[PDB]
Design an enzyme around this catalytic site. Structure first.
Site, PDB file in Angstrom:
ATOM      1  CG  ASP A 144      44.642  58.004  46.858  1.00 44.58           C
ATOM      2  OD1 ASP A 144      45.628  57.307  46.530  1.00 44.58           O
ATOM      3  OD2 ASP A 144      43.657  58.265  46.143  1.00 44.58           O
ATOM      4  CB  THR A 145      50.240  56.538  49.145  1.00 44.43           C
ATOM      5  OG1 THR A 145      49.846  55.269  48.612  1.00 44.43           O
ATOM      6  CG2 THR A 145      50.188  56.486  50.664  1.00 44.43           C
ATOM      7  N   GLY A 146      48.609  57.349  46.271  1.00 44.54           N
ATOM      8  CA  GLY A 146      48.682  57.557  44.831  1.00 44.54           C
ATOM      9  C   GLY A 146      48.138  58.871  44.345  1.00 44.54           C
TER      10      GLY A 146
HETATM   11  C1  LIG Z   1      39.264  49.186  41.781  1.00 38.83           C
HETATM   12  O1  LIG Z   1      40.656  49.467  41.645  1.00 38.83           O
HETATM   13  C2  LIG Z   1      41.060  50.761  41.405  1.00 38.83           C
HETATM   14  C3  LIG Z   1      40.126  51.774  41.237  1.00 38.83           C
HETATM   15  C4  LIG Z   1      40.547  53.082  41.004  1.00 38.83           C
HETATM   16  C5  LIG Z   1      41.901  53.395  40.937  1.00 38.83           C
HETATM   17  S1  LIG Z   1      42.383  54.909  40.658  1.00 38.83           S
HETATM   18  O2  LIG Z   1      43.648  54.838  39.983  1.00 38.83           O
HETATM   19  O3  LIG Z   1      41.363  55.581  39.901  1.00 38.83           O
HETATM   20  N1  LIG Z   1      42.536  55.719  42.046  1.00 38.83           N
HETATM   21  C6  LIG Z   1      41.440  55.510  42.998  1.00 38.83           C
HETATM   22  C7  LIG Z   1      41.289  56.760  43.864  1.00 38.83           C
HETATM   23  C8  LIG Z   1      40.036  56.632  44.724  1.00 38.83           C
HETATM   24  C9  LIG Z   1      38.860  56.699  43.798  1.00 38.83           C
HETATM   25  C10 LIG Z   1      37.901  55.699  43.802  1.00 38.83           C
HETATM   26  C11 LIG Z   1      36.824  55.769  42.932  1.00 38.83           C
HETATM   27  C12 LIG Z   1      36.725  56.838  42.055  1.00 38.83           C
HETATM   28  C13 LIG Z   1      37.693  57.838  42.062  1.00 38.83           C
HETATM   29  C14 LIG Z   1      38.769  57.773  42.926  1.00 38.83           C
HETATM   30  C15 LIG Z   1      43.856  55.531  42.664  1.00 38.83           C
HETATM   31  C16 LIG Z   1      44.382  56.934  42.927  1.00 38.83           C
HETATM   32  O4  LIG Z   1      45.437  56.818  43.895  1.00 38.83           O
HETATM   33  C17 LIG Z   1      44.865  57.583  41.625  1.00 38.83           C
HETATM   34  C18 LIG Z   1      46.108  56.869  41.084  1.00 38.83           C
HETATM   35  C19 LIG Z   1      46.551  57.494  39.784  1.00 38.83           C
HETATM   36  C20 LIG Z   1      47.660  58.326  39.746  1.00 38.83           C
HETATM   37  C21 LIG Z   1      48.048  58.923  38.551  1.00 38.83           C
HETATM   38  C22 LIG Z   1      47.342  58.665  37.390  1.00 38.83           C
HETATM   39  C23 LIG Z   1      46.244  57.821  37.422  1.00 38.83           C
HETATM   40  C24 LIG Z   1      45.842  57.243  38.616  1.00 38.83           C
HETATM   41  N2  LIG Z   1      45.141  59.005  41.807  1.00 38.83           N
HETATM   42  C25 LIG Z   1      44.353  60.038  41.513  1.00 38.83           C
HETATM   43  O5  LIG Z   1      43.271  59.969  41.021  1.00 38.83           O
HETATM   44  C26 LIG Z   1      44.794  61.443  41.777  1.00 38.83           C
HETATM   45  C27 LIG Z   1      44.146  62.211  42.733  1.00 38.83           C
HETATM   46  C28 LIG Z   1      44.584  63.508  42.965  1.00 38.83           C
HETATM   47  C29 LIG Z   1      45.642  64.028  42.237  1.00 38.83           C
HETATM   48  C30 LIG Z   1      46.290  63.254  41.287  1.00 38.83           C
HETATM   49  O6  LIG Z   1      47.344  63.756  40.584  1.00 38.83           O
HETATM   50  C31 LIG Z   1      45.865  61.956  41.061  1.00 38.83           C
HETATM   51  C32 LIG Z   1      42.828  52.371  41.085  1.00 38.83           C
HETATM   52  C33 LIG Z   1      42.410  51.065  41.328  1.00 38.83           C
END
Ligand SMILES: COc1ccc(S(=O)(=O)N(CCCc2ccccc2)C[C@@H](O)[C@H](Cc2ccccc2)NC(=O)c2cccc(O)c2)cc1
Lengths: 99, 99
Positions: free
Chosen positions: A25-27
């Site tokens: 997860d690059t995000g």
């Molecule tokens: C269906 O499409 C999407 C669904 C989810 C997301 S996401 O943004 O929540 N998400 C889905 C993750 C998988 C997952 C799947 C299901 C439940 C939980 C996690 C994308 C992540 O990369 C998310 C991006 C991010 C960064 C900063 C602020 C807000 C969001 N990062 C994080 O949640 C994150 C984790 C650790 C540390 C941190 O500082 C941030 C994006 C798109």
């Protein structure tokens, strides 16, 4: 390896003798694992994602083998919905984005 | 380009008359953009992340330029703290993970 993105980039990790599936997860700044027991001291921490903030347990200097590549670093444990390998460990295994 | 992960992988995208900074996010199935009043029909949706769910508007067939590469697809608009480019568009611009 090279991993394409038409499917979720799920990989097998090894942590404490346990095999788990985790999302590259690059995000994610940090690595966040679903609730599990890990040895050693931890400290309470809060992190924020798309839906708000959660409480996690921070464990430092934990070995994680990601698709056979060794990292040793910080792992957060908490009510993440999926196991997430974040940039802190992706950098250790030399992962980059390319297009 | 090759983008390392020492810092957040933020790049410039364009959607109409808005150039925006967005995260190249392999852990996101979908692209989620900060609040913006896009033209055309949309459908309500809830998406889940760390911390819970947010309500978003799903717009389809929206052209989005990412670092000069053309894409077209579904954009979710809602109260995300960061613009997220998910896999639906990352594939279209040829993005892979490599280690
Ligand atoms: C269906 O499409 C999407 C669904 C989810 C997301 S996401 O943004 O929540 N998400 C889905 C993750 C998988 C997952 C799947 C299901 C439940 C939980 C996690 C994308 C992540 O990369 C998310 C991006 C991010 C960064 C900063 C602020 C807000 C969001 N990062 C994080 O949640 C994150 C984790 C650790 C540390 C941190 O500082 C941030 C994006 C798109």
């Amino acid at each position: 390896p090279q991993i394409t993105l038409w499917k979720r980039p799920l990989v097998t990790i090894r942590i404490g003798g346990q095999l788990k599936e985790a999302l590259l997860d690059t995000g994610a700044d940090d690595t966040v694992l679903e609730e599990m027991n890990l040895p050693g001291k931890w400290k309470p921490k809060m992190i924020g994602g798309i839906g708000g903030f959660i409480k996690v347990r921070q464990y430092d200097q934990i070995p994680i083998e990601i698709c056979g590549h060794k990292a040793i670093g910080t792992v957060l444990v908490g009510p993440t919905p999926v196991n997430i390998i974040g940039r802190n460990l992706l950098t250790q295994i030399g992962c980059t984005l390319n297009f």
